[PDB]
Structure formats: structure tokens, C-alpha cells
């Protein structure tokens, strides 16, 4: 109920504790026309399933810095050559260096890249934002525009869905089967009733 992502009805709560999932919460049954059938998730006799912790889904600063040096060297070598060959760069070349480097390479392709060239001292004013806005900003130290988000959660959510039993392993806990939709595709959540 907790670690299920938000659109599947859960709260999408991140975790950094050794949270064990009992094997009584990875079992789901569906009634085909011929007859009821039952399923588990650890279909081979293995260890107890464990919620993935955020600890394993954030690259260490050391690796990020050395990779930033290497990736910016690659970009410099891939741009000075482009001067001689007379063509602009493209997503095709830099996809291998995507989402890497402390000023993330994806920032170069950002729409407002020109105006952010005239944004100087942005980190200092981000730090002093605490005195102007009431609620503290957890990401005071950076700014998503100027160096991109420095973390990825797609793998984390992938592994959470995999460990929780998937769409049917989570929906068995829900009231989804009571609603009787033929399949879970083609649905949206009305986060706000009109009334």
C-alpha cells in the first residue's frame, strides 16, 4: 500500500530501510472461464523479496565527478571536430553521454539555453531564497535548469514494480478486480472530483 507508485493507487514512498515483503503478499488468483488459477511471484523457491532501497539508485559523487570530467572531454573532442566538419551536433552523437556530467549534457539541448547564458550567480540567489519564501527548499544547493536533475528514479520504480509483483501483484491488493475493467490499460485517475 505504501511503496506502490502514485498512479497505481499507492503513495510512491521512497525507502532506505530493509523492508521485507512476506510471500503472502505476492500471490494473486484470476478466474478464467475454464476455472480459477493462482500465481506467486518467486515461482522458484528462493529468498524473501526485499524492497529496493534508494541507497542503490544514486551514483556516488566520486564516480559522478570523474565521469563528468571524462564526458566533458568527450564533448569537447566531439565539438571541436564539428567546427572543422561544419555541422551542428545532435542527439545521436550525445545519447551515449546523456544524463552524465554534473552540468548534465541534456542541459546543452535545453530550450532556454540562450537566456540561461545570461543567468549568473543563480546558485547564490537559490541559497538565499530561504529568506524570501516561507517553506525551505530541499534542493537549495542546485537548480534543475542550470545543471539538470542529478538523480534518476526510473530504474528504482522499475525494480519496485518488479519486486512488488507487477501490475497484477499490486492490483490483487487493490479493489481493481471489483471494478471489473477488462484490462488495466486505457485508464486515468481523476485526482479531483468536479464537485
Amino acid at each position: 500500500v505504501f511503496y506502490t507508485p502514485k498512479e497505481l493507487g499507492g503513495l510512491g514512498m521512497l525507502s532506505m530501510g530493509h523492508v521485507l515483503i512476506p510471500q503472502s503478499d505476492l500471490r494473486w488468483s484470476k478466474q478464467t472461464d475454464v476455472g480459477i488459477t493462482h500465481f506467486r511471484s518467486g515461482m522458484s523457491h528462493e529468498e524473501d523479496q526485499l524492497i529496493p532501497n534508494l541507497y542503490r539508485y544514486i551514483q556516488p559523487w566520486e564516480s559522478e565527478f570523474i565521469d563528468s570530467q571524462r564526458v566533458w572531454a568527450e564533448y569537447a573532442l566531439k565539438r571541436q571536430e564539428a567546427i572543422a566538419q561544419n555541422r551542428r551536433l545532435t542527439l545521436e552523437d550525445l545519447e551515449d553521454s546523456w544524463d552524465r556530467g554534473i552540468p548534465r549534457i541534456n542541459t546543452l539541448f535545453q530550450k532556454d539555453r540562450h537566456t540561461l547564458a545570461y543567468d549568473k550567480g543563480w546558485r547564490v540567489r537559490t541559497d538565499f531564497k530561504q529568506y524570501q519564501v516561507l517553506k525551505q527548499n530541499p534542493f537549495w544547493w542546485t537548480h534543475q535548469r542550470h545543471d539538470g536533475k542529478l538523480w534518476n528514479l526510473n530504474n528504482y520504480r522499475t525494480d519496485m514494480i518488479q519486486a512488488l509483483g507487477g501490475v497484477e501483484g499490486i492490483l490483487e491488493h487493490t479493489l481493481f478486480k471489483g471494478t471489473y475493467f477488462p484490462t488495466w490499460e486505457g485508464l486515468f485517475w481523476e485526482k479531483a472530483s468536479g464537485f
Partner: peptide
Amino acid sequence: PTGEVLSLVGKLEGTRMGDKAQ
């Protein structure tokens, strides 16, 4: 079995931060 969160202190013997996140 219980839903209480167990501290992963002493649970880091065979894991790294960058592992399972490429």
C-alpha cells in the same frame, strides 16, 4: 513479515550505491 522498517545498518556488506543503477 511485519511492515516495520528495518535499519539497513549492518546490511551493506555486499552492496554499492552505483550498483543496479547504470
